[PDB]
Design a binder for this molecule. Sequence first.
Ligand SMILES: Nc1ncnc2c1ncn2[C@@H]1O[C@H](COP(=O)(O)OP(=O)(O)OP(=O)(O)O)[C@@H](O)[C@H]1O
Lengths: 809, 723
Amino acid sequence: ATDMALALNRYLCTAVLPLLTRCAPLFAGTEHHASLIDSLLHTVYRLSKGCSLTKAQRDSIEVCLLSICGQLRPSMMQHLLRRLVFDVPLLNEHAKMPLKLLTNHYERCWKYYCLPGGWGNFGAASEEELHLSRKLFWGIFDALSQKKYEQELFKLALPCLSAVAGALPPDYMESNYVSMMEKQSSMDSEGNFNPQPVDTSNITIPEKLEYFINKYAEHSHDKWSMDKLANGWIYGEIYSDSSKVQPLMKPYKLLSEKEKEIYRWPIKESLKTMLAWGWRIERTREGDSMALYNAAHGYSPRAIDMSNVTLSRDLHAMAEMMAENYHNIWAKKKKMELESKGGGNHPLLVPYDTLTAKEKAKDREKAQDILKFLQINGYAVSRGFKDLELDTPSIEKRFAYSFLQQLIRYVDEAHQYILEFDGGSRGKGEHFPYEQEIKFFAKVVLPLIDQYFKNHRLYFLSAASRPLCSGGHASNKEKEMVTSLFCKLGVLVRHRISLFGNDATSIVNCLHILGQTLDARTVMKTGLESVKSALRAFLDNAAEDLEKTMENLKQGQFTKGVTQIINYTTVALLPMLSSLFEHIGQHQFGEDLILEDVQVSCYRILTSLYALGTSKSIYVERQRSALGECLAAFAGAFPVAFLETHLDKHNIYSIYNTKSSRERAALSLPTNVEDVCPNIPSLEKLMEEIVELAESGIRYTQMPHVMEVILPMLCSYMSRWWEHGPENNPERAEMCCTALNSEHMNTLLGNILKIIYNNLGIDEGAWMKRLAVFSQPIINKVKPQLLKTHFLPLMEKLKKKAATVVSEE
Amino acid sequence: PCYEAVLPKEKLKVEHSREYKQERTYTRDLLGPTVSLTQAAFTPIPVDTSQIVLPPHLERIREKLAENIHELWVMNKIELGWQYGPVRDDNKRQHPCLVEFSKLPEQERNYNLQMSLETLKTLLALGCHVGISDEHAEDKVKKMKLPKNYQLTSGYKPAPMDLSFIKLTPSQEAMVDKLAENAHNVWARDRIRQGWTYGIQQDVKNRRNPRLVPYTLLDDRTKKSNKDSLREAVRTLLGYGYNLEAPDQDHAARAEVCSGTGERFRIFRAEKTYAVKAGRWYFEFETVTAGDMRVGWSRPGCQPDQELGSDERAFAFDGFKAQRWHQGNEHYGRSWQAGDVVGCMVDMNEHTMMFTLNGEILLDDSGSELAFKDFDVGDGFIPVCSLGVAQVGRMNFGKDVSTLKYFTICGLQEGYEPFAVNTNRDITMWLSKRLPQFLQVPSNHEHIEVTRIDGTIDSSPCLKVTQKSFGSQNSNTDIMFYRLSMPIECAEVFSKRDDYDFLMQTSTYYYSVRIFPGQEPANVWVGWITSDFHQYDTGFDLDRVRTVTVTLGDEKGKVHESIKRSNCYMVCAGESMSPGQGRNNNGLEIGCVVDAASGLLTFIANGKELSTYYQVEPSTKLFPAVFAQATSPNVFQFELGRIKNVMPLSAGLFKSEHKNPVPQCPPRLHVQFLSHVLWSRMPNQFLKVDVSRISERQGWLVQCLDPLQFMSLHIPEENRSVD
Ligand SMILES: Nc1ncnc2c1ncn2[C@@H]1O[C@H](COP(=O)(O)OP(=O)(O)OP(=O)(O)O)[C@@H](O)[C@H]1O
């Protein structure tokens, strides 16, 4: 509230921070100034947390810190992420800037956190860093779930959560690493800074190290003698600093133990902190051999110079650890001193992470000196010997115990969401069962899982047999539970589209992505029977809904509920089935998926699809567009020949060929391999149909369902049944199933090309873009000898339309 | 005989000692480094199972396993047709062990049980989880009967448990393969501990068995025997019902980097003089293998030890990662396969490069066809390629246009010219040199610095070696080998205040080294080396130095002389001091003394003579040398001083100063260091040798008749020769 605080804040936010914002690009590489820039970021975030600031000042803080962090290298500001990880979850009012900063940082460092090699020339995230990210992720879940609905707060929370989820590598990260590291932090983490040095009262030095203590006391006396002759002190029999004479420049060998105990005191404190932290010292034969192996006045003017000795990297982190403890002890002592005095505020009271290198110099040099004296005398300090067992090596700790499987388990939010709708639909009210949880799910969970599955596209379908990902592949039973997220399919019932409201598009897009993210082979090979039952039950329900749609299109039902059922089909059921079936056909998962009862449901689905395609009623006239994408998807997915029925016995995946003992007649069956398709399509029938098509002077606008549904059937059908063995040895289990694919598909190559040519010859056309997409896989099969003399008329028709368009306009 | 050392799946071939030393054409195979774990073959590394603890369930099922192993063994014997016999008769198909297990010979019974418990202990050892499936099923599954043919003549009843319903999972099959490998390992280890070895023919007299090979090399017959026996073992376990789960498969991250420490990749480039500075140029790179390989255009100053594209010196394409390399890497194009063709073209007068794979233009992340579109001409570009471990390439410069397999498809229309479009003779190759050589420390070296301290009335001339980058970013911390540019030559024949006359007469020379305080003396080796020293090893010790002992003398009248020949005569500074640890108040001084009249090498510690000495052959050239691993900004300092009754080093180095007691460090003398940054020129023509096998009796004829000579330039002070 003082005028100095206001004036200083104005000066900063008007001159200093904007200048740093302007010159932010200069912060690309600061390998020298890790501590300096960490102090900068910590101070800036402390100013941000500080109150009594205007909106413009807060905006300046936000933009400056965002620019600096964005330009900064990922390796540093680890401590800034520590403070943010502790502060953001409980915070819901000042968390705007920290949340945006975390979003930007994770979006930038997406590769660094996830890819095992890291970003590139920057290494990978440390185990502590990724554990901190884990803590942030789960704390944000807890806070977001518990907090009330705030539109802007959630609009920031969702992108940050998606970015953190994408950055954290789902395969292993640490598998929660059992998390045996519990490093105490000052409650600068829990508010303002007070230091809490680790108590060593119960710690007692062993009676063994005292040779080392005595020797380092000798070295300390040597260093203080260096002070003596640097300051110019002279030997004296009495203490008189005014006359510039040094009291008793005389060896510790015969000095009294009192001041020798004063030298010993820092040594004892250092070793007691050592043992309280629980590291212990090992003694080599080099040091022990030296221990057993080893004029008047004139105290030694020579001391062993230790700055030349180098230190290992782990021991350097150790030295930093002792340095931060020492600064904590000093800060605590100064804190009691200022509390005894009146409201003292020393500038160096900030924590060690906020300190700068110049202030860290004394603590760092003291810790490095004691460690180097240890090393020279031959004593090696040992770190993880305590709790040396961790039991992970990624062998006993399968999957990710607390990120991946815990996330997919917390997807039980979807199951409880289904239960909430089941309770509420019986008289849905304005207050809802629990509107907070309803809004939380609707505005968080669906986009979160959508973006997460889009980001980790490659991991879930990565398998040991097929290396989709260079890193670890998806795990057993975790692929199964990924499939079990088909509770999202158990929800979105015919009547729930309006209940979701505008979230219908979001949920169907999420469902598109999740269905694309599926491993049917693993699910069937190693999966839970309830999950298999859920999958087959949803596909049976989809077949039942399609049959209901046929009861609707019969016109005996439409003549409200029927309209909303049709709308449900059009907006969700047909696109999601189209996507799932495209995915399974692309990955050749249809053979494993469609075996017996799914096969029955798929024949029901087929009868439905061909029936709506041939339905000339105007009700499905708009829908005929995506109906085309769906039947092409199913034609490319289903593993048994549709329009060839005389080869059902030859086919090995046929329902009768698999269950001809009793089950085919046990189930509802058409009783004949030709009767499985009561519809018309037969071989030469549809050859002759597509031949007379566009040759009998037909028009798309006259009747478009033929070239809108039948050709896509043919396209995907010949695509995958020419994936079925091309030009192998016939009758040898490679073309028993097809055989006849050898030449008729090759001729109807030119048939479809000529149909397209006539479709261009007729005056108007825009649908062939869909037909061109459907024909794309076919022209891959087309060899150069029959692209010549066949695509030249395509050029002729192209220039014909170009000339007509130019002449008309 | 030497033919007995052939691996069973290989044939003898009298081939060249070197790899490129074949008279060929542009079709020459350029070979990268080779993975160097080829012939180690058998090194028994069994799985240690003595440390593990046996759970009680496995403990009391152990005797069931041993028993059922006994029945399965007797079943195999009886179904093959064996019968009881006091002596081993393989041809007669008689077996002594086909006995009732209780009455069976005790030593054979100890075998039958040791296989069992070692098998289960291995199962435990490599991390297989044992769990209960159904103890009720374990009690239910019993042994059915066997016919009289399957009944053995010993009177016992082979009792087969229910093998019919037992199924095997692929994970169990894989762990059983591991078990078979381990069993073969332990068996052959025991065989060698008896004292057997490997041979192409099985001989009891010489105790050679062709089965002492790695399990991969092991023939299927014994391998299938292990397979089937282990089938019965694993199906016994599954019938007992205690289900096993092997640990999940672990990915391989070794990266197959098994090349020598000198090389991880090999760079082949055109000669610098063939650098092109204007026009359209094209060349071809066939990839016999698919792997870590790069091809492109390099500046004349490109370094052989650095990867292509990691610096501004080269513009390369790496199809292994489908990337383009110049001062970093970016995604570019697709990845080749085996036997593909990469056409590299540069159009330099508007400064563009493009690459084609099998005649198809390669694109950037965008649709741009230009791999690199803005590079200054500078000093020109030359074709270059880099190959990693076990990689085979071919570069076609277009000397014969018909040889180019994709020039017509891409480049002939664009007007690009083959690199050797009109050349009367073959282009000259230059390769990354494999053997390190000593060369003067560059003034711009990143790590080490050499300063020449002029001698004074109090201090002798010195050459101080310091580390520029010590304590700095990612500084190299490896043993580096320094030497002096001029050698001391021993006498051609061996005879069989200091005194001025003794100084004048003597042929004894001295130099010293000062290892500075704070530099680990155990990391500094001081002495002399010859011109044959080229061992750049990260871990150097005085025990791995090359050494031979030539002994001359009639064996009837015993050896009358033995001479020890070596290329390194040094002592470790830490071992030289050994006054305990410490005493590093001042820099440690080690003095090397050579008497050239007698070829005697002695060393002196800080005032005291050391116990290590050497005796060299006459006319030996010894280079002063220090091998140091830097643990200080200041490591060591050559001191060209002198001691009592010993001449300075300059006297023996320089003929003009032969009788000058005043120590000197003339500018010719300098500090060289072992390095890999050098190029080797492939000869334009090799010796035409014919190798064939005349017959079984005659042998392998090799024949070379056409003479071939080259003119050798000799550097005398370095004792070196080049083409
Ligand atoms: N009780 C046993 N009865 C029969 N054969 C046994 C018995 N115990 C071990 N063996 C196998 O018989 C071998 C005895 O023959 P020998 O030592 O000459 O080797 P081998 O027949 O080449 O062995 P292997 O089949 O292991 O390669 C043993 O090495 C071992 O493999």
